Amino acid sequence: QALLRILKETEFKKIKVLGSGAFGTVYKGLWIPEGEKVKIPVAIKELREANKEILDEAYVMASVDNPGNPHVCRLLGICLTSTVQLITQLMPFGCLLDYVREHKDNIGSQYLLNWCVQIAKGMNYLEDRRLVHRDLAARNVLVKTPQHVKITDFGLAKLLGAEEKEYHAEGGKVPIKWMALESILHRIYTHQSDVWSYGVTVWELMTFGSKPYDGIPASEISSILEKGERLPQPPICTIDVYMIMRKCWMIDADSRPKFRELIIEFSKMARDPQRYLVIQGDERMHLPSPTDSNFYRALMEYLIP
Ligand SMILES: *CCC(=O)N1CCC[C@@H]1C#Cc1cnccc1-c1[nH]c2c(c1Nc1cccc(F)c1OC)C(=O)NCC2
C-alpha cells in the first residue's frame, strides 16, 4: 500500500539550492518534525517548469517503500507550497556520476566493484516489486558514503501489472544512449532492458564518468547497435569485467544477465578486486569511511523517440 507523509512547510529551515539540471532543481535543507526537535538534513526536489509527473514519481517510491532496501532511495514525504516537492534524506556526497569524475585519482578497484554489487542489489529489489526503472544511469545513483550508494529518480519508472511482463511507452522523452535496442525500436521496457542500462552505468563508473557514444547523435544509436558496435573496453577493465558489460548489451533480452546473477559475479570479483580491475596506485588509494575517526570532517540526454 502507498502512503505519503505530507510534511508541513513550516517544518523546513535553511533551504538553499544545491543544483539544477534535466532532473529539475534540488535544494538541501533541515527538516524539524512536529513534536520532535531532531534536525534531519534533507534534499528537496522540484521538476523543471508537471505536478502530474512528480506525484507519479512519489507514488512509485511509496509503492516500493516496504520492506525497502539500503541501495534504493526512499521518500521521507512530500511538501505542498507553490510547487509539489519530494523530500528525502540528504546524500551529502551527491550523485555518483559527479563523484567518480571528481575523485578519479582515489577510486580503487574495491570501490568500483562494490558499487556494481550494490546497484545490482537495489535493482534486484525493484525487479521483485515488479518495478521497471527505465532511467538507470550514474547520474541517478547517489552516494550516501563513498562505500554505500543508492538508486534514485523514479520519474520514468513503471509498475508492471500482475499479468504483465513488459511496459509499452508513448512519445515522452527518454535516455536513448542508456536504452536497450528493443526500447529504441519498439518502445518496450522490461527488467532485461534495465539490465542493458545497468551495463551502460557500469561502463560510466569504469571510465570515471565518460559520456557514452560522445559526439554521436542519439538518432544514429539504433543503427550502431544493429551493426554489432558497442561501447569500448575501459582501460582499467580486465576481459572478465568487459564481458559482463557485453552480455548486458546482447540483442536477445533473455540472453542478458539477470540482476541476481550480476550480484553473484560482481561479489566474486569484489573478493579479489586487483585481479579484475588494473588501476595504477590502487593500494595507495583511500576514501573517507564512517569507521574512520575523522569521517565527520568529510561531511563538513533525454530525447523524443
Ligand atoms: C548528479 C548530480 C546531482 O544529482 N546533483 C548536483 C547537485 C544537485 C544534485 C543532487 C542531489 C541529491 C542529494 N541528496 C539526495 C538526493 C539528491 C538527488 N539528486 C538527483 C536526484 C536526487 N534525489 C532526490 C532529491 C530530492 C528529493 C527526492 F525525493 C529525491 O529522490 C527522488 C534525482 O531524483 N535525480 C537525479 C539527481
Short description:
This protein is of the alpha+beta class and 305 residues long. The protein is built from 10 helices and 11 strands. Helix 3 (109-128) packs antiparallel against helix 5 and helix 5 (191-206) runs antiparallel to helix 7.
How does this model look, in words?
The protein has helices spanning about 50-65, 95-100, 110-130, 180-185, 190-205, 220-225, 240-250, 260-270, 275, 295-300; strands at about 10-20, 25-30, 40-45, 75-80, 85-90, 130, 140-145, 150, 160, 165-170, 190. With about 300 residues, the chain is an alpha+beta fold. It has two domains: about 10-90, Phosphorylase Kinase, domain 1 (2-Layer Sandwich); about 95-285, Transferase(Phosphotransferase), domain 1 (Orthogonal Bundle). It has a five-stranded antiparallel beta sheet with strand order 1-2-3-5-4. A two-stranded antiparallel ribbon has the order 6-9. Strand 4 (about 75-80) and strand 5 (about 85-90) form a beta hairpin. The structure holds the ligand *CCC(=O)N1CCC[C@@H]1C#Cc1cnccc1-c1[nH]c2c(c1Nc1cccc(F)c1OC)C(=O)NCC2. The ligand *CCC(=O)N1CCC[C@@H]1C#Cc1cnccc1-c1[nH]c2c(c1Nc1cccc(F)c1OC)C(=O)NCC2 binds near residues 87, 88, 139, 140 and 142. This is Epidermal growth factor receptor. Belongs to the protein kinase superfamily. Tyr protein kinase family. EGF receptor subfamily. It is found in: Cell membrane; Endoplasmic reticulum membrane; Golgi apparatus membrane; Nucleus membrane.
